[PDB]
């Protein structure tokens, strides 16, 4: 029930505010990726992924597009999505939160099983 | 082996002038260094000369990273048959 904000501004403003100030809103590591240049040397799949998140289904559960990417910086443009990133074998499904922003998608997916121990 | 025609006859005419060429072993190299005037590969070139090895027209030595090819007189008359030239021009190896 509590309102959500990111450094004093609200999610409608986040979808209203653009990249040249999203760099100063975000941290130094995130903005260094944004300030490196165009997303076309290798990030053509990133461009088609933001298009595939820009296409809008009607009011139901959000569309499922599995991905082979773990170095994605998640943006406010595709919050509330339905996505599973590649883990080497399968796809871990995580519903996109509004506090989900600011991190990596491959950070939020577990890859190795937690280690159990029986008898040596 | 979906290789073109004009590049191969360019290789053949530069073979008929001098019957020896050198080529380094590098599959990941799209351009020949000596034949920089036109767009030619290298892997198709070395596959063409190992096809000439399978036919029995040259002999092959590989020293460090470069393939070496040597022209034979039976290879010379094969070049004369394939290029259809009269027997009046000879490669410069036999000349003085």
């Amino acid at each position: 029930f509590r309102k959500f904000t990111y450094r004093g501004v609200d999610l409608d403003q986040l979808l209203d505010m653009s990249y040249e100030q999203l760099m100063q809103l975000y941290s130094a590591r995130q903005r260094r990726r944004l300030s490196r240049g165009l997303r076309r040397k290798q990030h053509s799949l990133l461009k088609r992924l933001r298009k595939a998140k820009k296409e809008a289904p009607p009011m139901e559960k959000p569309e499922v597009v599995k991905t082979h990417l773990r170095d994605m910086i998640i943006l406010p443009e595709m919050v509330g999505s339905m996505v599973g990133v590649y883990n080497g074998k399968t796809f871990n499904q995580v519903e996109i939160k509004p506090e989900m922003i600011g991190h990596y998608l491959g950070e939020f997916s577990i890859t190795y099983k937690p280690v159990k121990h029986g008898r040596p | 082996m979906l290789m073109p025609k004009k590049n191969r006859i360019a290789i053949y005419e530069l073979l008929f002038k001098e019957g020896v060429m050198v080529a380094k072993k590098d599959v990941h190299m799209p351009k020949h260094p000596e034949l920089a005037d036109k767009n030619v590969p290298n892997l198709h070139v070395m596959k063409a000369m190992q096809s000439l090895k399978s036919r029995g027209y040259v002999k092959e030595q590989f020293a460090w990273r470069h393939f070496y090819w040597y022209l034979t007189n039976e290879g010379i008359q094969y070049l004369r048959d394939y290029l259809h030239l009269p027997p009046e021009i000879v490669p410069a190896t036999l000349r003085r």
Binding site: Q42 | K25, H28, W64, R65
Partner: protein
């Protein structure tokens, strides 16, 4: 495209930018004075370079 996907990892940097100039293996390279050639072939052909046993 296979012809455009065949070179997707550039070899501008890293260990893959160079290999041995004799045995063509990417281990034990000597970048000092631009030898760019592995240590065992270095020991095999070190006498032919001019390298001597003095120390």
């Amino acid at each position: 495209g296979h012809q455009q996907l065949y070179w997707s990892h550039p070899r501008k940097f890293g260990q893959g930018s160079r290999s041995c100039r004799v045995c063509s293996n990417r281990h034990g390279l000597i970048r000092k004075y631009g030898l760019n050639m592995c240590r065992q072939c270095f020991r095999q052909y070190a006498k032919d370079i001019g390298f001597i046993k003095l120390d």
